[model samples]
Structure formats: structure tokens, C-alpha cells
Target: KIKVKQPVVELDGDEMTRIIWDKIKKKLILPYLDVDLKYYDLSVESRDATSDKITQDAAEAIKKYGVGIKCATITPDEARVKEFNLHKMWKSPNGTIRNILGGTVFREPIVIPRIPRLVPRWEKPIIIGRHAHGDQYKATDTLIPGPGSLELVYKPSDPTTAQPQTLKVYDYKGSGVAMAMYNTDESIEGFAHSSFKLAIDKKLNLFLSTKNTILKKYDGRFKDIFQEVYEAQYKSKFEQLGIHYEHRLIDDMVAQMIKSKGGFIMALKNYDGDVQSDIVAQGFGSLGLMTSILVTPDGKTFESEAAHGTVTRHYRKYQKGEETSTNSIASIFAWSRGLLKRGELDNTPALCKFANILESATLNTVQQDGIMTKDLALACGNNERSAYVTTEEFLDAVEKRLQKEIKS
Candidate 1:
């Protein structure tokens, strides 16, 4: 029997993912391992019921326990607001957790031979780390009606002694839009630390992208902070590992990213990350095959999840009593990545081996045995005559392969 020495925080999420989460634990996790789970329901309804306290509680538990495996949860928009009947459009659960954890999110695509990627030369994985806090996401935006001056104002708390600083941001001639964005040194430092740590851990080169040529003072701070953190904290370690860090213009980074093969980490500003991650996901093949990992600045905490949405279309099909072919590989890797970290922390080699076997078995089933969900089959150009199985059938295939690994 596999024994886990510590409890793991299991965050249950929404939609089709919640259904798949239960199946994964039942068929793959509980059958082989004896472990304690600190469970929290993070469904939209549950979040609304608890007033989103559950999300905070889960974040805190991850801090205490050191590892968390999360299923994909909904972040309500106007359409979702009406559908869920939410009291207010709640903030993203991932965003809340990242704020509390003080970390960077790295999205890595799971590469398999059976799935054909648009960029066929990307044999290795290119991981993208998003500075998920501040920038455009937290910017103050307004529409200028007509000719008016836009100013950026800053006042010290003790205004009696210190004078306020003001700068004319723009002098508008006609109706236009303006936004002011800011990022703190503290957050940028944490992001840099996390990025460097991850690059060291992966033994890969790290590249941070920013348009510092234009926004000298604004984006320049990000580049400066990363360089400072690298030189002060990680430069020696990085040299020992033969990995180096560099800053690049965002435009040049994208061009280089397309021209070069995979196998490196790219650190991006909040807005660039928000847009580029989708391109990376699609270029690699399927979002279903991408895994997201959050590592805190101290490198003491980690959280893993699938880098995709809740599969709302499949959930609708299931609701109508139709069989669905949803890919669950990334979600399965969520558990594997989390459990592997847990095993390392608890000094449980057996548990770590189990996690490895499960992940290997999953890849083997798809890449070697030619068993996969519809999305993967479609990725392989099997659209018209798809050779894919139902969601349960795909899991069963993985379970059978895993049982073989355990026996051997």
C-alpha cells in the first residue's frame, strides 16, 4: 500500500471538471494510496453561498499544507452572472489565490507524439510564466469626452510636510481613451524570484519580456527588478546550472518564440501573458493538454491545475443525457504534480513513484497505445472519422494502464 505522510488540500471546482475530479480520485487515487485529504468545495454556488470565503480558506490551507490540486472553476462575467444568478460578479478564484500566495503562474503544455501541434518542431515544452498581478488587469481606464488634459497625481500620506507630485499624462484633442496602470516593487520582486527559482528548478534559460523601449519608467521597472533579483539571489546558482536570464522586447520575444524550438521559460507582463498564453496553448495543440503551476516566491508552496476552462459545452451535453468525450489529461496531471511535490516534502519515495507511474501511464495510453479523447484525435486530423472514446472510457484506459504499472 502507498502511504502519504501528510494531508493534501483538494479544491473541488465547477462544471464538467468537478465530475471528472471525483472520478479521478475514485478510480486512480483512492484505490492505490492511503492519504488524508483536506477538501474544499470551490464551486460557483458554494463560493456564492460562503461569500467566496471558501476560496480564501483553500488558499490559506495551501499555504499551510504546501500543496494544492485544483479543478477549473468559473470566473463569472456578465453572461455567467446572469446564468449563475450571482450576487455580484466575483473576482477570479485563481487571481484571489495568486494574490494570497504571492507567486507566478507557469503554464506548460504536455507534449505527446500522437497529437500533432501546429508548430511541429516544438518537441520539447516551452513554459510561460505570467505575472498575474497588476498591469492592465488592475489599470484605471476612462474615456475622454473631448479636449482635456490627463494628469497622473501622487500625494504623500503626510501632505502637510511633503508636496504632491503631478505630471501631465496626455493632452487630448478629441474623444479618446486613457488608462493608468501601476505595479509595486514588492510584487515585481516576488515575481522575479519565482521565475528565477522555476528556471533553476527546470534547468532552462529564462527570458523576461517587456516593451521597455517605449515605457521606459513603467516597463523598465519590471526588467530592472528581475535583473536585480537574478544578480543578487540567483545568478550564481543559475551559472552553476548553466542557465542564464535575459530581458527582451515583447515584440522580439514573440518573433523569437515562433522561430526557435521549445524548451525554455518565458516570463511575461500581466497583459502580454493574458494574450500570449492562448496562442501558446493553441499552437502546442490543445488547451486540454496544458498544465498550470503556481510557485510562491519562497519556493515552499505550489498549486497545480489544468490551464483550461470548465468545458461548458460538454457539461451541456451531459445534462442532455448525451455521452461526452472530454480530455482529462491535464486535470490528471494536476493531481500528479501536486502529489509528487507532496511526496518530496513528506519524504515518501513510494508516493512519488506512484505519481510518476500514473503520469507515465497516462502518456503511454495516448502516445503509445493510441487511446485518447476526441479533442486529441481531432488534433491528429481524425476529425471526420474520429477514433476517440467517451470520457469514462478514456479514464478506464488510463486506469488499466496504471494497474499494469503498479503490478510491474
Candidate 2:
């Protein structure tokens, strides 16, 4: 008998989400697999107690283990700060983990043939890779009262060897938004490499979207950098694999996205990504079916999670002892994706088989068995949707399917 090693997993969370977290573990995970589960309770109280050291520690553990699957947590606002009695409204755990890991977040929706997509043309899911570290998401914007110069100053790391770089980004004559943003050459290079690697892994076309024509020097830098790295480092491999990478204006790329049958990676800068990922999530019909993966620059360390918020509404129903339909597919995929990466890295065929079996089982349960969540059932069609199950029932169906499939 061969011993299968499971990837070390870290669990994190919030208030209502913390409730669904238990069912996922009880019904979906424990029945099928026995693996090392490194748990971190990122609940509001715990976060406040530790001052978020738990989140930092979890990230380091993920780096050591090479794979981590996370649950959604709150980035507390002022009201939440008061409500939770938090010491402070901390930054998002996801944001902190991504920074520590050094990568982009790729959000891809799970497509079911039965589900009615907002954009009916989409047969495949568009994977939106967002450069999370810097750029518009971290930019400072302000309103100018009158005619004034807007300048960006880049202080040099070394005073002796290099000159400080400064640029006049905009000289406005009237009131308008003045914002300054930047991406280091190192970060952009990493972004390009990760995008290319992901494209190769998925065997899909890669598109980097930017408004380079409008903001020539600003957005143009992103286009130029990706092109340079692609040609110099990735071009040969991409060509050999028959996969392609190209740059396109944001507007043109978005129109292309609507017209084309998905199944390609669309890389976006911070703001575009923040907006477009939501659009992708909605178009695919439900955030409940979306999956997010964070791939480190080296592509060695990875974290996977459901892109959807914890189904707080459904959880409220579950609390009432009423049968509530909530999708567990994305959470199941988090485990499957993490395990798949672990399998690929360690060359463990049994683990690989387990991952594939589980994923296929989930899809089969939804598509064939007709037992699915309300969102997916509705998407499949009004008539086909009545077989909706509670989270536990759906997970049990998957576990049973996996057991049968593996034996056969």
C-alpha cells in the first residue's frame, strides 16, 4: 500500500463565514481524507487578541508548506470595528497573505452547462489575474482646488549609485482627480512571469489589458514591461506549447471578452482587476461558484479559496433548522486545487487521483445527479433546480461519488 501525503492546509475566517467553515470541515473534508489541517481562527475576537499575528503566522506556514486553502474573512470597517469591539479595523487577511507570498490573485468562476450566464455567450470562465500588490489599489488621489502641478517623486534606494526619479504626471488647469500610482520593475516582471506560467499551466491564451494608448507612459509601462519579459523569457516556451500572450487596450479587450467564448486568462492592473473580476463573477451567474488562486512569483507557493463570500444568508437559515441551499462546490475546489498542486509537486499519484476524483465527483453531483445548490440549480433552469440540497447533503453526495469513482 502506498502512503499518500496531504498538503498542509491553513484555515482562516470571519463571523457568519465561521459558521459555514464548520460544515465544510465536518461534511465535506473529514469523511473522505485524513490530512494535516493547520487551523488558524481569524475570527474577529481572535484577530483582535493576536493583533493579526495569526494571519502573518498562517502565511509563513503556507510558504513553508507550498499550499494553503483559505476561507473568506472580513476587512473590518468603522462600524465593524465598533461592533466587534476590535482594537483596530485591521487590513484584509487576504491582502496581507498575498503580499507575504508575492503573487497575483486569479479569480475564475466555475461554469456549469445548466446555469444561465448573464452573458449567454460565455461557455467558459474568464480567469482574471489581478496584480494585487501595488498600483491603483494603493494609490493616493486628491482634488485640486485650482491650477496646480501634480508630481510624483520616487526616492532612490541608494543615494550614491542612482539618481532620484521624479515625473510631472499631470498639470491640471481646472478641478479634476489627480492620482499617482506605480509598480516596481521587479513586481511587473514577476507579474508577467506568473501570468505566462499560469497560461502555460491552463493551456489557454493570455491577454494583458491596459489603457496604454490613453495613458502612454503610465499604463504603457505595463504593456512594454509585459512585452519585454514575454519576448525575452517566455516567448520560446509559449510558442513551443502553442499558447500565446498579447497586450490589448482595456476597452478593446473587454469588448473582445464579451464577444469571445471565454477560457482565457485576462490579466488586469489593480483597478481594472477589482472591477472586472466582479463582472466575471456575476456573469458566470454566482459568486458561490467562483474560485480564487494566489500563485507566488516562483509558482511554488499557492493558496486556493472560494471567490464567493461565506453564505451568511444561507447560514442564517441553517441556524433555524430549516433546509437551506448553499453551494459547497467552490470550497470543495479549494481542497481539490490545493491537493492537485501538492500532488504535482511531490509526484504523488494517489494524491493526484484523489484531487481529480473529488473535483469530477462534485461536477457530476451537480450536472448528473441533479443535486446542487439553489444558485446553480436556478442557473441550470427553473425546472431542473428543485433538487437543491443543504450544504451537508451536497457534500455527502460528493463524498459518496468520490468513493464509488475511486473504487471503480
Candidate 3:
């Protein structure tokens, strides 16, 4: 029997993903190994009841244990607030976790030969690294009133001797909008380190995208920090691996992304990442095939999850006792990736092999056997009734394949 040496933090989520999460653990994970799971229910109700303390606890546990696997969760909005009857609109659990973890989120698509990609030439994966903190995501904004003066203010705490700095940001002639954003050097440095580490791990070249020509100081800082970190910390290592790092304008990067055959890590500022990752997801195939990983700067801790949100539409149908064909591969990888890291940390080669076997079985069941969920089949332009299976059927096929691999 395979034995896992340490506990892994499992953050259960909401909606259809939560349903899939349970089945994955039951059929794919628990049957194969003896493991310890530090479970945290991150359901909307659970987070509401605990005032989001559960999310904080889960993040802390991941920091201590060094690995976590999470399911897709709901970040409440007005509609969700009314539906769930939440105490208050809770902050995004992911943002909370990232705030505590201080890492970059990297999203990579799982490519299978049979799966038809919009960019068919992209045989290799284009891993997108998002700097999840600062910039527009954390910006302060205000709707400007008619005919007003707007100023950027900076007052030193020790203003007894130091002068307060002020600059006229804008002189509004009519109603408009204004905003301010900021980023820390420390956070940027961490983002740089994590991006470099991911590129090195994947043995691919790295590029940081920014609009330095327009927002010279703001975007320039990101470009400068990545270059500085690369040269000082990772240049020799990357050179030895035959990989390189470069900075590109955001427009140029997007153009290059479309024309290139993939196989690189593109580091993006917060806003750029939010937009470009979706493009990458669609180009690759389906959001269901994208895997999201959070890696800390030191490369010692990781959290894996599906890049897609909770499948709300499918959950609604599932609530009415209807069958659903949701693809659970990304969610399954959430477990495999976390377990593989745990195996590496615990120095258990057998456990690592098990993780690989499970992953291979999952992909083989789709690419080699042509067994997949409705979403993937639809992506392949297959509308035949026999083209797709129910969610459980797909998981069962993967489990059956896995069982054979284990036996051999």
C-alpha cells in the first residue's frame, strides 16, 4: 500500500465542483493510497458562518504543510448574496488566500491530442503567470463630480520636518472618473522570483509583459524588477538550462502569443493577466482543461485548483436531479498536482509515481480511448450522441484506467 507521510490541506468548494470534488476523492484518490487530509470546507455557507476565518485557517495550514488542493468556490456578489442570504458580501476567497500566501498564480492548459484547439499549432502549453496582487485589482477609484480639481497626495508620517507632496492629477471640466493604484517592490520581486522559478521548472523561456511606453513609471517598475531579479538571481541558472528571460510590450506580447507555437511562460501585470489568461484558455480549448497553480517565491509551497469558476449553471441543473456532463479533469489534477508535491516533499518516490500514473490514466482515457465529457466533445465539434459520457461515467473510465495502471 502507498503511504503519504504528511497531511495535505484540502479546501472543499461550492456548486458542481464541490459535487465533483467528493467523487474524485472517493473514486480516484482515497482508494489508491493511505493519506491524511486536513479538510477545510470553503463552501459559501461555511465561509459565511465562519466569517471567512476558515479561508485564513486553510491558507495558514497550506503555509505550514506546504501543499494544498482546492475546488472552485463562489465569490459572492449581489446575486449570490441574496441567493445564499450571506451576512455580508464576502471578499473573494482566492484574493484572501493569495494575500496570505503572497504568490503568483500560474495557469496551464492540459493538452490532449484528440482535443481540437482554436490555435491548432499550439502543441505546447503556454503557461500564464498572473501577478495576483496590486495594480487595478486594488486600485482606489471615485466618480468625479462636475468641474472639480483632482490631486494626488502623499503625506509623510514624520511631516514635522518633511514636506507633504501634492500634484494636480486632473482639472475636471465635466463629470468623469479618477483613480489611483499602487504596487510594492517587495510584491513585484516575489512575482519575479515565482515566474522565474516556474520557467526553470518547466524548462521554458520567460517573458514579462507591460505597457511601459504609456504608463512609464508604473509599468516600467514591473519590467525593471523582473529584469533585475532575473539577472541577479536566475540568469546563470536559466542560461545553463538554455532558457532566457525578456521584457515585451503588452501589445507585442499578445501578437507574438497568437503567432507563436506556445511553450513559454508569460509573466503579466495584474490587469493584463486577468485578460490574457482568458484568451489563452479559449485558444487552448476549454476552461475545463486549464489547471491553476499558486507558487510561492521560494518555490517551497504550492496550491492547486481549477482555473475556472464554480459551474453554477450545471449546479442549477444538478439541483433539479438532472444528469450533467461537467468535465472534472482540472479538478482531478488539483488533487494529483498537490499529492505529487506532497510526495516530493516527503521523499516518497512511490507516491510520486502513483500521482503520475493517475495523471497519465486521466489523459489517456481521453486522448487514446476517446472517452470525455460533453464540454470537451463539443470543443472537438462532435455532436454525436455517443461522443460524450456523463460526469460519473468519465470519472469511472479514468478510475478503471488507473486501476489497470496500478495493477501493472
Top candidate when judged by TM-score against the true structure: 3
> lDDT of candidate 1 vs native?
0.88
Quote the positional error of residue 80 for candidate 2 in Å: 2.3
Q: Which lDDT tens digits does candidate 3 get at residues 194-231?
A: 89987898899999999899999888999888889888
All candidates in order of lDDT, best leading? 3, 1, 2
What TM-score quantifies how close candidate 2 is to the native fold?
A: 0.89
- The lDDT of each candidate is 0.88, 0.78, 0.89
lDDT of 2 by residue, 1-408 (tens): 234375566666764456556766675556656677878777667778999999898889899888988877777889878876889879878778877876688888877666678887888778998886777655677878888888889787998988897878788898888776666777777888889888988899999999888889878888989999888888888989998888998989999998888889999886788788988888877777777888888878889876677645666676787776667777778777877788788788877887887788888888788788676766666655455776667777877897788789
Q: How close is candidate 3 to the true structure, as a TM-score?
A: 0.95
Q: Can you rank all candidates by TM-score, best first? A: 3, 1, 2
* lDDT of model 3, residue 400: 96
Put down candidate 1 lDDT per residue, 1-408, tens digits, no spaces: 688998999999998999988999999999998989999999999999999999999999999999999999999889988987888898889888877886688888887876778887777788899997777766789889999899999989999989998998889989999998888899899889888888998899999999999999988999999999988989899989988899999988999898888889999887787688888888888878888888877777989876778868999999999999998998999999999989998999999999999999999999999888888888888775458889989999999999998889
Clashing pairs in 3: none
Sliding window of 10 residues with minimal summed lDDT for model 3: 131-140
Better of 1 and 3 by TM-score: 3
